[PDB]
Design a protein around this ligand. Structure first.
Ligand SMILES: [Mg+2]
Length: 368
């Protein structure tokens, strides 16, 4: 027979959302588990901030078996916490486990996603306790970051197409805040624009911002994955040296020095984006084989059309996850090129909402 379980999932170290998807993927991988539904992402304060959700699963696993599975997944992914919140109306009391979880009614970050998945759930020991009133008595933020297949990469530009006052240079910080409130799961930080800048200057812009990011780590309701945008082998080297621990991906619009780049990225176990800078398949295909040739796993490679109607065809040919950067590009948005940042951002949300349905792995945007 099948039993419906709610699994609570929390994390507050490393790449938080990645840890959550990895735990879910691990569950889904079991031949005796089916994933019915995922809850939203919730952020709570560390007694840096926790990221919590819950998933509802169907399984023939007995509770104790299911607990064994959770412990192993925890050991594989300790930077993640997996708990059996509930099994419908089941009541199990033992030293090994109690269902519902002892602390469920004392943790808004547990009860909140649980009631989201099962709005009608009542605690089987307290069938008269209206858990919504209980939830309110407790002490929580429901993020706009989601567990969706398409993740949003928010653009944080450190260059000069973007404005200091006499005693205020807060613009880039405010915009990090904006992106995080609005659901960006990933931020892409770039220090160049669209006159060259030196290695040392590009590095300094990036580093000042990552050092700022780190100082805010516990102030962030959500710690996004970090992508660095640079075409320079040397800034990559410097930035990974100091900050690899918060960097998830490298976004590189320059095939110059690929071999050395691939060795670095391989060594640091980070994601790489191939950018185009039809036949386009083969361009990406060639670069693609070099990277593999230098030691980086194929799963870690994304491709990008590089605009500067049939992407799904291309991805499927390519064997690689799609990253799409359509934000504020008047051509692909089919707008006049004079249109204001207000109308550009509008058309782009409209199109973002469209690419989200096709399961584009990453969309890169200025605004959510
Ligand atoms: Mg635990």
């Amino acid at each position: 027979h099948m039993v419906q379980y709610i699994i609570g999932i929390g994390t507050n170290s490393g790449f938080t959302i990645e840890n959550i998807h990895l735990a879910i993927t691990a569950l889904e991988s079991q031949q005796n588990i089916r994933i019915i539904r995922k809850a939203s992402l919730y952020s709570s304060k560390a007694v840096i901030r926790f990221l919590n959700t819950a998933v509802k699963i169907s399984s023939s696993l007995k509770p104790d078996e299911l607990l064994v599975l959770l412990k192993d997944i925890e050991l594989k992914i300790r930077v993640i916490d997996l708990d059996i919140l509930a099994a419908e109306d089941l009541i199990l009391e033992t030293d090994k486990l109690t269902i519902p979880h002892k602390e469920l009614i004392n943790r808004s970050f547990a009860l909140a996603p649980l009631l989201e998945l099962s709005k009608g759930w009542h605690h089987p020991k307290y069938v008269e306790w209206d858990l919504n009133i209980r939830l309110k008595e407790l002490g929580i933020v429901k993020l706009k970051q989601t567990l969706a297949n398409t993740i949003r990469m928010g653009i944080v530009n450190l260059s000069n197409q973007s404005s200091d006052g006499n005693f205020d240079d807060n613009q880039r910080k405010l915009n990090l805040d904006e992106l995080i409130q609005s659901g960006a799961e990933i931020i892409d930080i770039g220090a160049e624009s669209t006159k060259p800048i030196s290695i040392e200057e590009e590095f300094n812009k990036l580093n000042e911002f990552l050092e700022y990011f780190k100082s805010q780590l516990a102030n962030l309701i959500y710690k996004p994955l970090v992508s660095i945008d640079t075409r320079k082998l040397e800034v990559m080297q410097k930035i990974l040296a100091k900050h690899h621990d918060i960097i998830w991906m490298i976004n590189d619009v320059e095939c110059n020095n690929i071999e050395q780049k691939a060795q670095l990225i391989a060594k640091y176990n980070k994601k790489y984006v191939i950018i185009h800078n039809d036949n386009v398949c083969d361009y990406i295909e060639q670069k693609k084989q070099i990277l593999l040739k230098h030691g980086i796993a194929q799963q870690n490679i994304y491709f990008d059309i590089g605009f500067g109607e049939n992407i799904i065809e291309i991805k499927r040919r390519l064997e690689l996850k799609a990253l799409v950067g359509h934000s504020r590009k008047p051509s692909v948005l089919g707008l006049t090129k004079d249109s204001n940042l207000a109308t550009l951002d509008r058309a782009t949300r409209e199109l973002s909402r469209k690419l989200e349905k096709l399961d584009i792995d990453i969309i890169r945007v200025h605004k959510i």
